[PDB]
């Protein structure tokens, strides 16, 4: 089959500025005068929407900062200004020939000014806690670049390995990112501590934030 | 507008079959040039799989050729995706699309909203579904951030809504992560102004259609 392969695989950028990602068909994809490579634009949760068709026509409703160019085997994707709704995956595909083949796609996100996080802390529900199970769950949210770093500790004790954390993608409101990390126990050993302890890095922070509760007291 | 509707997605056995609709709406599947099914795998990037055109031929990439069908129903305006012998590198979401008349026909301008196929021996499980409790009390009466926690489903995927779909703004819900149970796990926070916590209701919409369980969870401060 024709294998397409993109470049680069990922890239950030910051805002208003130009982008540009390559295409590549093992073979020609050009067919009488025309060249049968279309753009995708993916979003977060949504289906592949299309942008440029047959290499260079913009499809109705896109906006004119995306345009298309290339023949033969050699194609590329321009946003001549890159705006903060056009975080997504991008791909090529070529229909010139079944099966129909696309890229492998490239990650586009967008650099930001630095944002520090929101940290809040919230404690296990009674609800949860009479399954003989309790969530510990710390809130990361809105801040900028994605790297973070968060510590977990129980009466100033350091937990590793009991907790897992997850990142959203980036929000095109805003360009931040936001991150929960939860520390899971079990009821009888949330209930042999009293203090708990979210430690908070990250570079929009001149020091490390802390958010704590007390199991017993409030 | 013209609209593609997504069906029969879920958990499905190794070596078993699935059998998936895409119903169309604001427009004639007659008038089609080609409808087509196209999946995406983590790491695979977007695979098409089959096509229908509008005298009835069909078409079939060779990487899944043998075990798949398409086919069509002009009476209800639907066409569908049948497989079977079924292995784990076939989970995927499986959108539909509608090729083009023009240009060469076979991009897709057309997609439905996709629906997931997830291959495991596993049975289906609920979540449970528990309250990320406000602040205690405000920080300087300013933004509070409030919550659900849903834990402890199988298959993928839950949706989440706050306030049957009323509040978008400040929302945020989470990647699942797979926990070492074999389950998965998610949350879903929003912010707010921590004046309208007393005021204020806040409701988060719990769905996970494998195992039939719909949660609405009232938040409030405790």
């Known amino acids: 089959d024709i294998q397409l392969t993109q470049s680069p695989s990922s890239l950030s950028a910051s805002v208003g500025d130009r982008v540009t990602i390559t295409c590549r068909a093992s073979?020609?994809?050009?067919?009488?005068?025309?060249?049968?490579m279309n753009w995708y634009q993916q979003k977060p949760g949504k289906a592949p929407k299309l942008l440029i068709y047959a290499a260079s026509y913009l499809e109705s409703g896109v906006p004119s900062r995306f345009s298309g160019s290339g023949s033969g085997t050699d194609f590329t994707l321009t946003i001549s200004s890159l705006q903060p709704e056009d975080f997504a995956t991008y791909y090529c595909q070529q229909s010139h020939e079944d099966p129909y083949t696309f890229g492998q796609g490239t990650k586009v996100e967008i650099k930001r000014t630095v944002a520090a996080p929101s940290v809040f802390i919230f404690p296990p529900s009674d609800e949860q806690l009479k399954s003989g199970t309790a969530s510990v769950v710390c809130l990361l949210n809105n801040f900028y670049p994605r790297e973070a770093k968060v510590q977990w500790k129980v009466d100033n004790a350091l937990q590793s390995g009991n907790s897992q954390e997850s990142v959203t993608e980036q929000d095109s409101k805003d360009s931040t990112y936001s991150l929960s990390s939860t520390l899971t126990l079990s009821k009888a050993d949330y209930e042999k501590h009293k203090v708990y302890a979210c430690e908070v890095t990250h570079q929009g922070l001149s020091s490390p934030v802390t958010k704590s509760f007390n199991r017993g007291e409030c | 507008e013209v609209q593609l509707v997504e069906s029969g997605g879920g958990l499905v056995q190794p070596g078993g079959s699935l059998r998936l609709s895409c119903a169309v709406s604001?427009?004639?599947?007659?008038?089609?040039?080609?409808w087509n099914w196209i999946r995406q795998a983590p790491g695979k990037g977007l695979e098409w799989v089959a096509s229908?055109?509008?005298?009835?031929?069909?078409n079939y990439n060779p990487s899944v050729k043998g075990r798949i069908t398409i086919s069509r129903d002009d009476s209800k305006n639907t066409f569908y995706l049948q497989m079977n012998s079924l292995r784990a590198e076939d989970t995927a979401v499986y959108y539909c699309?509608?090729?083009?008349?023009?240009?060469?026909?076979?991009?897709?301008?057309?997609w439905g909203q996709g629906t997931l196929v997830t291959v495991s021996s596993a049975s289906t499980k609920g979540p449970s579904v528990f309250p990320l409790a406000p602040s205690s009390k405000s920080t300087s009466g300013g933004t509070a951030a409030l919550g659900c926690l849903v834990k402890d489903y199988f298959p993928e995927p839950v949706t989440v809504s706050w306030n049957s779909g009323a509040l978008t703004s400040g929302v945020h819900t989470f990647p699942a992560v797979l926990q070492s149970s074999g389950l998965y796990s998610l949350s879903s926070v929003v912010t707010v102004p921590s004046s309208s916590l007393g005021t204020q209701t806040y409701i988060c919409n719990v769905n996970h259609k494998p195992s039939n369980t719909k949660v609405d969870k009232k938040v409030e401060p405790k």
């Open positions: 229908i055109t509008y005298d009835g031929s069909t």
């Open positions: 604001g427009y004639s599947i007659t008038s089609g040039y080609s």
């Open positions: 699309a509608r090729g083009s008349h023009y240009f060469g026909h076979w991009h897709f301008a057309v």
């Open positions: 073979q020609s994809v050009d067919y009488d005068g025309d060249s049968y």
